[PDB]
Amino acid sequence: KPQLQRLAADADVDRMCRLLEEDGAFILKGLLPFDVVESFNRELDVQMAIPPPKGERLLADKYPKYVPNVATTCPTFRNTVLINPVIHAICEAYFQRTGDYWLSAAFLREIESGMPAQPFHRDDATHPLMHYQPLEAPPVSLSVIFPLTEFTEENGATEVILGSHRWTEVGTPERDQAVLATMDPGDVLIVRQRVVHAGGGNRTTAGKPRRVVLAYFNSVQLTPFETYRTMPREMVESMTVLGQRMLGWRTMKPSDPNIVGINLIDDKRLENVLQLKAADS
Amino acid sequence: KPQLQRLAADADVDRMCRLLEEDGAFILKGLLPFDVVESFNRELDVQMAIPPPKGERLLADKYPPHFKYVPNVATTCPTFRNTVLINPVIHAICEAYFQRTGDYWLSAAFLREIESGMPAQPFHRDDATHPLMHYQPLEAPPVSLSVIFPLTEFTEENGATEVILGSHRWTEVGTPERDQAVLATMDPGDVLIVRQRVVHAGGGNRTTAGKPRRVVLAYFNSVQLTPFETYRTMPREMVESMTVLGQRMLGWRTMKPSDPNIVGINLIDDKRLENVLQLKAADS
Ligand SMILES: O=C(O)CCC(=O)C(=O)O
Ligand SMILES: O=C(O)CCC(=O)C(=O)O
Ligand SMILES: [Co+2]
Numbered sequence: 038k039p040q041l042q043r044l045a046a047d048a049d050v051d052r053m054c055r056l057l058e059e060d061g062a063f064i065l066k067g068l069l070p071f072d073v074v075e076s077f078n079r080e081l082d083v084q085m086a087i088p089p090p091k092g093e094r095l096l097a098d099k100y101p102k103y104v105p106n107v108a109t110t111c112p113t114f115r116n117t118v119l120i121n122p123v124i125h126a127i128c129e130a131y132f133q134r135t136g137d138y139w140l141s142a143a144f145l146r147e148i149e150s151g152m153p154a155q156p157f158h159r160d161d162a163t164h165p166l167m168h169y170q171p172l173e174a175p176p177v178s179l180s181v182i183f184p185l186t187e188f189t190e191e192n193g194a195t196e197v198i199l200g201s202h203r204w205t206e207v208g209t210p211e212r213d214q215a216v217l218a219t220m221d222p223g224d225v226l227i228v229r230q231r232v233v234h235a236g237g238g239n240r241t242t243a244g245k246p247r248r249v250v251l252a253y254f255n256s257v258q259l260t261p262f263e264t265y266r267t268m269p270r271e272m273v274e275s276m277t278v279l280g281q282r283m284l285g286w287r288t289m290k291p292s293d294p295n296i297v298g299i300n301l302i303d304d305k306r307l308e309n310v311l312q313l314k315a316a317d318s
Numbered sequence: 319k320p321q322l323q324r325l326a327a328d329a330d331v332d333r334m335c336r337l338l339e340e341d342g343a344f345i346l347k348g349l350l351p352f353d354v355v356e357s358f359n360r361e362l363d364v365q366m367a368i369p370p371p372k373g374e375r376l377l378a379d380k381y382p383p384h385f386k387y388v389p390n391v392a393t394t395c396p397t398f399r400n401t402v403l404i405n406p407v408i409h410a411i412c413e414a415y416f417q418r419t420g421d422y423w424l425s426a427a428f429l430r431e432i433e434s435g436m437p438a439q440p441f442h443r444d445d446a447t448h449p450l451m452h453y454q455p456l457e458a459p460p461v462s463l464s465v466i467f468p469l470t471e472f473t474e475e476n477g478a479t480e481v482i483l484g485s486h487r488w489t490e491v492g493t494p495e496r497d498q499a500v501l502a503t504m505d506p507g508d509v510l511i512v513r514q515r516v517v518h519a520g521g522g523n524r525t526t527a528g529k530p531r532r533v534v535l536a537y538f539n540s541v542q543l544t545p546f547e548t549y550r551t552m553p554r555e556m557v558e559s560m561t562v563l564g565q566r567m568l569g570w571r572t573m574k575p576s577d578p579n580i581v582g583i584n585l586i587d588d589k590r591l592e593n594v595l596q597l598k599a600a601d602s
């Protein structure tokens with residue numbers, strides 16, 4: 038079976054745009070240096086050391102390993118991994134027909150030994166209107182998957198069904214129609230809208246949990262699933278302009294016919310109503 | 319030639335949804351009281367009195383000088399925020415119309431005040447703020463609804479909004495002629511409700527004496543779509559003054575798109591936005 042193509046971090050973005058249309062996904066090898074991986078990894082340990090919260094938990098009081106919206110608690114994500122110039126090179130070429138994009142969610146899944154595999158899916162459930170966009174329409178969503186520990190056949194490496202954005206519906210494919218996304222920490226797996234995929238769980242026995250940070254970059258026409266509006270101004274203003282636009286703190290622009298912009302108030306740019314400073318203001 | 323159907327404010331909502339299905343639009347007669355209309359205009363007058371720009375006007379700079387514009391009236395006009403925006407007949411229509419998509423909220427609400435001698439608007443669909451709407455099949459769950467408020471009477475002379483009935487079924491907006499449209503001639507207090515994908519335009523003000531035409535447009539869209547105007551800079555005493563419904567409309571609460579989204583949207587820290595904010599509301 039044709040496997041996921043592996044490209045170097047400085048590969049040709051024109052080539053990456055062809056892989057996403059042909060196969061539906063590709064892999065960047067070693068996009069992020071290991072010490073950025075280790076920084077992010079030690080910042081998530083801090084979060085998994087947080088006391089259990091004495092209130093509701095939307096996806097977590099839903100179940101009997103989860104770190105939501107990692108951009109607000111891990112400075113390594115929001116100030117390094119969020120603004121990776123290769124990723125933004127891929128998003129600009131990918132989103133060229135639909136316009137500006139921003140971060141709709143970024144969270145952590147940890148999969149301990151003995152956990153079952155994840156069902157086949159598309160990342161289409163949060164904004165169900167995507168279910169009804171035809172294949173030829175400008176894409177509105179792009180999945181960016183960061184292995185924080187090794188992805189293996191044995192620990193549940195993500196399974197991607199190549200070319201499956203051409204199916205109208207998911208149905209119920211069998212694990213054997215997919216290929217594995219084995220990767221080193223620092224690698225990245227990019228997944229096109231409508232491509233069927235599934236985490237593999239962790240059939241192992243010895244205690245080594247698989248770690249994956251999942252970032253969904255959507256058209257700015259699509260409401261961010263995570264709202265980053267409660268960040269402190271002081272944390273917001275030490276980000277770059279690029280980061281603030283991802284986290285929804287600036288006015289944005291879908292491609293024409295939206296000839297004005299989006300996320301604005303007082304007929305002014307949100308960053309000017311708030312008089313927002315930025316690290317690269 | 320068939321016209322827009324005027325209904326009673328107390329009309330069955332199935333009747334309303336039905337007319338949005340085949341005609342694409344209809345009018346409610348006498349939804350808002352006159353006392354509600356006159357103070358909205360007073361508040362708009364307070365805002366119209368303000369000289370407008372020492373600089374950039376994102377929307378107003380983008381369109382010819384054929385109208386005057388007051389943006390995001392929910393933040394400056396108490397009558398809209400506390401009465402018009404939470405009108406139950408408007409919400410009965412929305413809850414029935416957005417049944418398949420789940421929660422809806424307010425993408426924008428603004429005043430248009432059109433001066434005599436301005437030319438007619440061109441026939442558009444309101445699928446430009448979110449261009450992905452062009453691509454939904456007609457039969458897919460709708461994600462946008464336009465609510466058009468006469469703040470003066472609408473007449474053939476002042477430019478009552480021109481609606482082409484059934485135009486949401488067309489493949490393309492195309493090259494439409496004026497007498498394809500029927501006029502939403504209305505009096506202050508009525509409401510024009512216009513389904514997604516209906517082709518339409520504001521008329522030219524061909525009056526010679528009297529006050530300009532005023533219309534307030536409110537766009538309710540699925541909570542899946544990003545609001546054009548963001549109400550996140552309203553004062554906390556102002557937002558806590560609103561009702562739960564009013565706060566859900568203006569983006570201050572976690573919302574729920576239909577399944578397969580079984581979690582929601584507009585949340586943080588895996589909790590509801592209003593919980594994280596300890597947000598009081600007027601009726602909870
Ligand atoms: O766990 C993985 O590697 C896949 C996660 C995923 O695709 C999801 O959580 O939707
Ligand atoms: O409907 C009206 O009269 C106002 C004009 C309009 O529809 C628009 O600006 O989109
Ligand atoms: Co997924």
Ligand SMILES: [Co+2]
Binds near residue numbers: 442443444518519
């Ligand atoms: Co319009």
